[PDB]
Amino acid sequence: DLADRFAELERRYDARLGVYVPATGTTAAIEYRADERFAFCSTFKAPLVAAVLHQNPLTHLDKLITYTSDDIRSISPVAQQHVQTGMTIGQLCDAAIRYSDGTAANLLLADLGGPGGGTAAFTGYLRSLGDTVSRLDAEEPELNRDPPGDERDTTTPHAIALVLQQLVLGNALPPDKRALLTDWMARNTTGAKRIRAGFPADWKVIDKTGTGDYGRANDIAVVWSPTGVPYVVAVMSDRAGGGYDAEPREALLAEAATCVAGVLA
Ligand SMILES: CO/N=C(\C(=O)N[C@@H]1C(=O)N2C(C(=O)O)=C(CSc3nc(=O)c(=O)[nH]n3C)CS[C@H]12)c1csc(N)n1
Numbered sequence: 001d002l003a004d005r006f007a008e009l010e011r012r013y014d015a016r017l018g019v020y021v022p023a024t025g026t027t028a029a030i031e032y033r034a035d036e037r038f039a040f041c042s043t044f045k046a047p048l049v050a051a052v053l054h055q056n057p058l059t060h061l062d063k064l065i066t067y068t069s070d071d072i073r074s075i076s077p078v079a080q081q082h083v084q085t086g087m088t089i090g091q092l093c094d095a096a097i098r099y100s101d102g103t104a105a106n107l108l109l110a111d112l113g114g115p116g117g118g119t120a121a122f123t124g125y126l127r128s129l130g131d132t133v134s135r136l137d138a139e140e141p142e143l144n145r146d147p148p149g150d151e152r153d154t155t156t157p158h159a160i161a162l163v164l165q166q167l168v169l170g171n172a173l174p175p176d177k178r179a180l181l182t183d184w185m186a187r188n189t190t191g192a193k194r195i196r197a198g199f200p201a202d203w204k205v206i207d208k209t210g211t212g213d214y215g216r217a218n219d220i221a222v223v224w225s226p227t228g229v230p231y232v233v234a235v236m237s238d239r240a241g242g243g244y245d246a247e248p249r250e251a252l253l254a255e256a257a258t259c260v261a262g263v264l265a
Pocket residue numbers: 041042043074075100102141142144145190208209210211212213214215216
């Protein structure tokens with residue numbers, strides 16, 4: 001009744017919903033529209049922090065990068081207050097995952113690929129994870145604004161769930177660098193009402209969200225059962241037929257996570 005239960009979700013919230021859960025030795029693949037393209041939005045900041053972590057020693061995380069107030073072109077609740085102090089890369093990483101800071105991600109993009117090669121550098125990182133589907137093409141804020149059906153700035157639930165499976169659970173990042181990434185997303189302040197609300201409290205959830213135009217609302221997550229058996233949930237949604245200013249529904253992401261928790265009992 002999987003596809004039956006998610007289709008109702010789509011009818012009730014008037015939304016396109018994408019769901020992927022990788023197969024495990026015990027559980028099978030939960031896949032609803034898993035190979036359709038959904039806009040990254042702020043979800044890209046999580047594998048982007050991984051990219052900066054992978055390309056640099058830990059001594060790089062304490063490098064002072066200096067920006068201006070003119071450089072805050074988007075929702076940057078952490079970078080807003082450090083207009084003069086600059087920010088250590090480890091803090092921009094912190095701002096990128098936990099507070100979805102846009103100016104952080106734009107400075108993190110430049111540290112990775114330079115002034116004009118940041119998007120392509122980030123896309124090539126995902127290539128190195130075997131993700132040949134996703135693409136970042138724009139920087140903040142325009143990556144949240146691409147029209148529907150456009151392939152630019154898009155991933156799929158399948159590809160981002162497989163990517164995230166290598167970062168937290170796989171051997172893509174070294175033990176210590178992975179630890180800092182697993183901690184950052186477990187400290188995130190944005191995903192309370194998405195996948196967190198649908199998994200029981202004695203389950204452990206780590207997540208990075210994305211929200212954007214055309215009603216776009218995403219939550220990428222790794223979940224941990226009370227027995228410690230781990231899963232990676234990718235939930236992606238938009239309400240294109242609503243228009244650019246359509247209202248994202250967080251409770252949509254919540255219910256989809258409730259359904260996947262029900263089959264993971
Ligand atoms: C051009 O950029 N447009 C954006 C945008 O910057 N999106 C980013 C993104 O993915 N972000 C995320 C997040 O990570 O989910 C968030 C966090 S979600 C959230 N938390 C709150 O406490 C709250 O009161 N409201 N919201 C929405 C906000 S926008 C930023 C946008 C936001 S809503 C919309 N229609 N567009």
